[PDB]
Design a protein around this nucleic acid. Structure first.
Ligand SMILES: [Mg+2]
Ligand SMILES: [Mg+2]
Ligand SMILES: [Mg+2]
Ligand SMILES: [Mg+2]
Ligand SMILES: [Mg+2]
Ligand SMILES: [Mg+2]
Ligand SMILES: [Mg+2]
Ligand SMILES: [Mg+2]
Ligand SMILES: [Mg+2]
Ligand SMILES: [Mg+2]
Ligand SMILES: [Mg+2]
Ligand SMILES: [Mg+2]
Ligand SMILES: [Mg+2]
Ligand SMILES: [Mg+2]
Ligand SMILES: [Mg+2]
Ligand SMILES: [Mg+2]
Ligand SMILES: [Mg+2]
Ligand SMILES: [Mg+2]
Ligand SMILES: [Mg+2]
Ligand SMILES: [Mg+2]
Ligand SMILES: [Mg+2]
Ligand SMILES: [Mg+2]
Ligand SMILES: [Mg+2]
Ligand SMILES: [Mg+2]
Ligand SMILES: [Mg+2]
Ligand SMILES: [Mg+2]
Ligand SMILES: [Mg+2]
Ligand SMILES: [Mg+2]
Ligand SMILES: [Mg+2]
Ligand SMILES: [Mg+2]
Ligand SMILES: [Mg+2]
Ligand SMILES: [Mg+2]
Ligand SMILES: [Mg+2]
Ligand SMILES: [Mg+2]
Ligand SMILES: [Mg+2]
Ligand SMILES: [Mg+2]
Ligand SMILES: [Mg+2]
Ligand SMILES: [Mg+2]
Ligand SMILES: [Mg+2]
Ligand SMILES: [Mg+2]
Ligand SMILES: [Mg+2]
Ligand SMILES: [Mg+2]
Ligand SMILES: [Mg+2]
Ligand SMILES: [Zn+2]
Lengths: 161, 119, 146, 132, 62
RNA sequence: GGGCUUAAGUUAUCCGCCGAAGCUGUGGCAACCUGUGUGGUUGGGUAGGGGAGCGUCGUGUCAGUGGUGAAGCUGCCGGGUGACUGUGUGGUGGAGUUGAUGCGAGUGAGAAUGCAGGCAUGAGUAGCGUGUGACGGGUGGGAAUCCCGUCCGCCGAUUAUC
RNA sequence: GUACCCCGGGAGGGGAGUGAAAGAGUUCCUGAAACCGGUCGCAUGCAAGCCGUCAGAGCCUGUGUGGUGAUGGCGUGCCUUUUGAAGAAUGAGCCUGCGAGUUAGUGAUGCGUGGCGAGGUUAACCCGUGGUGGGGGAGUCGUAGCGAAAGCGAGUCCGAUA
């Protein structure tokens, strides 16, 4: 997001009229902020909103978010969804058998778990993640998480005491 | 997130133009001129809500003075007589009695006359 | 709610005062009180509740000291050198009604209602007044003890 | 919420009463100068009004006379009324579009000139409605 | 001189209301065959005649 | 100021009353202190410091809602200690938007001889830029101001011609 | 994109048609305020008005509350700047819109809050073409001070191992 200041608005180089004698207010440029078509004083400028949250804080928040619905019994683990070739009908079933429809799926296998990924990709009430990208926002937004066996194993292996 | 001022701005203007809905000239048509009079109106109303006590007490005292002087007794002697007799009927009820129940007011005048120090 | 008179609710009476040997100040205070109706328990500043006052023998109003020739009355026409001055004795001799009206008006509030009420004062320098039809009752200037 | 009995000029000016009306929009004359003659013509009988406006010296008489004649014709056609028993029940002039122009003046200045315009409305009803 | 202050609505209207005109009076043409309205002491624009019922004289060829 | 010495003047003295948003009575609100059943003290306020909020726009989430009519605009009837507001009830209108809780601001205007537009005031006022036009007829819905004609006037080292 | 008819020279309007809607008729969505008017209610031609406020009759209305307001009291605008302004000091004709405390730094220094805690924390960059996640401890602050420094060290420096 960006705006043009009085220095960036086109024109406005010269004094509009003499300082005295005209009976008009003293003006310095036609692009002064109080003019129609003039520059914006404190309008937005491009920026980044990223915050340097500590690693321990980010990880712990993730642990607490996962733990709340672990205690609430909202994590299921499946060996996999779908067999052979890949449909969305199959996994829709596997998950509806699990429970409800505000879902998170973990399949971790970042390179070749196309079967499960592309099956659950189009549900629109399922969010699919790799185990190395769980993140607190998605965990909190999820009403339940279903891990693939490999997904849970890889998350545990990536972070364990 | 550019914000346009009009929707929020008009609220106080409508309030003030409603508050100034009997004024003469610009004071009931123009928000800026109505705003100046509403400040004066609020100051006058606050001042007059406290001066009203004195105004009505003065009216009651004048009516009591007239009613008691009709009985040959000044207001000060009448009030001192009531105070000595121990009748704590106030300026207000006394004025209402004077206007409405003149016989009861005259009986109170007799009470004050009897309760006078006579000195 | 305090009582308030309603237009013609209070009935206005007619009094007559013989200004024979009565000081101008006392006469004017009494006239102002009667005209404004301050002796009535129904008094209200905003509604005329007073009575009509007919003053007779205004030419025989008593004055103390050297007022009859040293107490001056001034009028100005509103133009340069437009002052006239006459002593209260001369004014009582010539136009007593003007003198009594000036005194009463000075003692009466400065109001549109006061201007209206001052018309209720009928001043005559002689002992006779033409308002027998209105049947004015005699009024005696008195004082209440203590 | 929009629906039925939608507002109309006839409903606002007559409201189920007999009579008619006529509007001349964008009359190329000033509203005040039109009002100067509207004030005279309001409340008169329609035939008397048009005959008088044939003789009224002001330039506003002509458009107002034509409006009154048009209202009379509208009444005669849409309510069977006759021209000789109509009277001008209402008559007013509102302001229309104004054009800003420039008149050059001394010392290089330019003075604003306003070419104003008016809308004229006349409402005619049978004379029996005068005492109603 | 220049107007010191903007005149109030009451005063502006008090002065403006006096800018008006009187209605033209009109008189019925004495000619029975015309019966139209014309200005007093003026030839009838319709019949183009002038004078009383009896001694009528043509004035305007219209 | 009226008027006043027949004090409504001065003075000593006595008895009453009037008189403030002061004090007291009664009802509501608030800050602080205190042992925490009580109570006490306090609450004019510019520069300025501290604290807690209203409204607008965007937005995460949840709950929604909308042609059986959103936004906006505009009445009425109400509400709050304030900014303000109703989950009251109409009208206009025609496609969005409410509540909870967070997040982000081009977040609030009466002033800057502020900027843009619209419109008043003066005012139906001043002016309409050197002057000579008259009349008959015509045209036309409409003619002092167009056309034709006749009188008359004006320029003519230029009001001509190139 | 208004056939046809009527008044009109037209412009414009009145009927009628089209359309869910024409008071969506091309100046066309919504249509606010200044500003200009018609109608109705009340007041107003003896009155000295920072235009209000408190008291208050009458009339109208009663959609039993609202509109108006005779008359009485009290009452010298807003802002700026000032010892002090209703000021005959400044600015503002009016409405609508716009118009001024912002943002960036692994800046400086407090506070609130959260994490970890004798430790805290990464920067560049690498991986995640899948992001907001993981790696990266190079550095940096804390961990001992005192001295110009060599240096010494819970001491050090001036001093004479004072
Ligand atoms: Mg430049
Ligand atoms: Mg410059
Ligand atoms: Mg620009
Ligand atoms: Mg008294
Ligand atoms: Mg609505
Ligand atoms: Mg030039
Ligand atoms: Mg005048
Ligand atoms: Mg008090
Ligand atoms: Mg107190
Ligand atoms: Mg108390
Ligand atoms: Mg305070
Ligand atoms: Mg205090
Ligand atoms: Mg402050
Ligand atoms: Mg629905
Ligand atoms: Mg919106
Ligand atoms: Mg919200
Ligand atoms: Mg802003
Ligand atoms: Mg504004
Ligand atoms: Mg100027
Ligand atoms: Mg402008
Ligand atoms: Mg004007
Ligand atoms: Mg004139
Ligand atoms: Mg003039
Ligand atoms: Mg003139
Ligand atoms: Mg002239
Ligand atoms: Mg000329
Ligand atoms: Mg000419
Ligand atoms: Mg010729
Ligand atoms: Mg010549
Ligand atoms: Mg020659
Ligand atoms: Mg529909
Ligand atoms: Mg509409
Ligand atoms: Mg328009
Ligand atoms: Mg529109
Ligand atoms: Mg009168
Ligand atoms: Mg005075
Ligand atoms: Mg000074
Ligand atoms: Mg000034
Ligand atoms: Mg002044
Ligand atoms: Mg100065
Ligand atoms: Mg100025
Ligand atoms: Mg301005
Ligand atoms: Mg290191
Ligand atoms: Zn004729």
């Amino acid at each position: 997001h960006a705006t043009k200041t009085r220095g960036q608005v086109s024109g406005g180089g010269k004094k509009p009229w003499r300082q005295k004698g005209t009976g008009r207010a003293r003006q310095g440029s036609t692009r002064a902020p109080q003019w129609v078509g003039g520059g914006t004083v404190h309008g937005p400028q491009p920026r980044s909103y990223a915050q340097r949250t500590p690693k321990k804080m980010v990880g712990a928040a993730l642990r607490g978010a996962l733990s709340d619905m672990a205690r609430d019994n909202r994590i299921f683990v499946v060996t996999s969804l779908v067999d052979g070739d890949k449909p969305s009908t199959k996994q829709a079933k596997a998950v509806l058998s699990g429970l409800a429809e505000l879902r998170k799926v973990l399949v971790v296998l970042d390179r070749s778990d196309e079967i499960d990924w592309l099956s659950v990709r189009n549900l629109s009430e399922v969010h699919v993640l790799a185990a190395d990208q769980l993140n607190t926002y998605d965990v909190v937004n999820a009403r339940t998480i279903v891990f693939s066996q490999a997904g849970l194993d890889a998350f545990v292996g990536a972070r364990s005491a | 997130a550019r914000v346009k001022r009009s929707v929020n701005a008009k609220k106080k203007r409508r309030e003030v133009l409603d508050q100034a809905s009997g004024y003469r000239g610009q004071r009931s048509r123009l928000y800026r001129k109505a705003k100046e009079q509403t400040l004066h109106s609020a100051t006058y109303s606050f001042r007059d809500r406290r001066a009203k006590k004195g105004d009505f007490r003065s009216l009651w005292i004048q009516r009591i003075n007239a009613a008691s002087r009709a009985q040959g007794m000044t207001y000060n002697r009448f009030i001192n007589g009531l105070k000595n007799a121990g009748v704590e009927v106030d300026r207000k009820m006394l004025a209402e009695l004077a206007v409405s129940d003149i016989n009861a007011f005259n009986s109170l005048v007799e009470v004050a006359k009897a309760s006078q120090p006579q000195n | 709610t305090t009582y308030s008179p309603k237009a013609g609710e209070v009935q206005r009476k007619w009094y007559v005062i013989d200004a024979e040997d009565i000081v101008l100040g006392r006469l004017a205070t009494t006239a102002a009180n009667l005209l404004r109706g301050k002796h009535k328990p129904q008094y209200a500043p905003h509604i005329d509740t007073g009575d009509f006052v007919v003053v007779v023998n205004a030419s025989k109003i008593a004055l103390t000291g050297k007022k009859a020739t040293d107490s001056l009355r001034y009028d100005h026409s509103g133009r340069p050198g437009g002052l006239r001055v006459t002593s209260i004795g001369e004014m009582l001799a010539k136009n007593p009604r003007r003198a009594v009206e000036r005194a009463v008006w000075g003692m009466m509030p400065k109001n549109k209602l006061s201007r209206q009420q001052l018309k209720k004062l009928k001043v005559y320098g002689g002992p006779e007044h033409p308002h027998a039809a209105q049947n004015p009752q005699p009024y005696e200037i008195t004082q209440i003890a203590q | 919420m929009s629906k039925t009995e939608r507002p109309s000029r006839r409903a606002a000016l007559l409201g189920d009463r007999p009579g008619s009306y006529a509007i001349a929009r964008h009359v190329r004359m000033s509203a005040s100068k039109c009002r100067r003659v509207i004030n005279l013509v309001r409340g008169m009988d329609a035939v008397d009004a048009v005959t008088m406006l044939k003789f009224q010296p002001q330039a506003a008489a002509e458009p107002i006379r034509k409006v009154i004649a048009s209202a009379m014709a509208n009444a005669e056609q849409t309510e069977g009324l006759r021209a000789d028993d109509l009277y001008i029940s209402q008559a007013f002039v509102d302001e229309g579009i104004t054009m800003r122009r420039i008149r050059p003046r001394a010392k290089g200045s330019a003075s604003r000139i306003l070419k104003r315009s008016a809308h004229i409305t006349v409402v005619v009803e049978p004379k029996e409605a005068r005492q109603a | 001189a220049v107007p010191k202050r903007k005149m109030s609505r009451s005063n502006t209207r008090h002065r403006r209301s006096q800018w008006k005109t009187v209605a033209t009076k009109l008189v019925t043409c004495a000619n029975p065959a015309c019966g139209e309205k014309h200005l007093p002491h003026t030839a009838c624009p319709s019949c183009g005649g002038y004078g009383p019922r009896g001694d009528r004289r043509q004035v305007v060829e219209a």
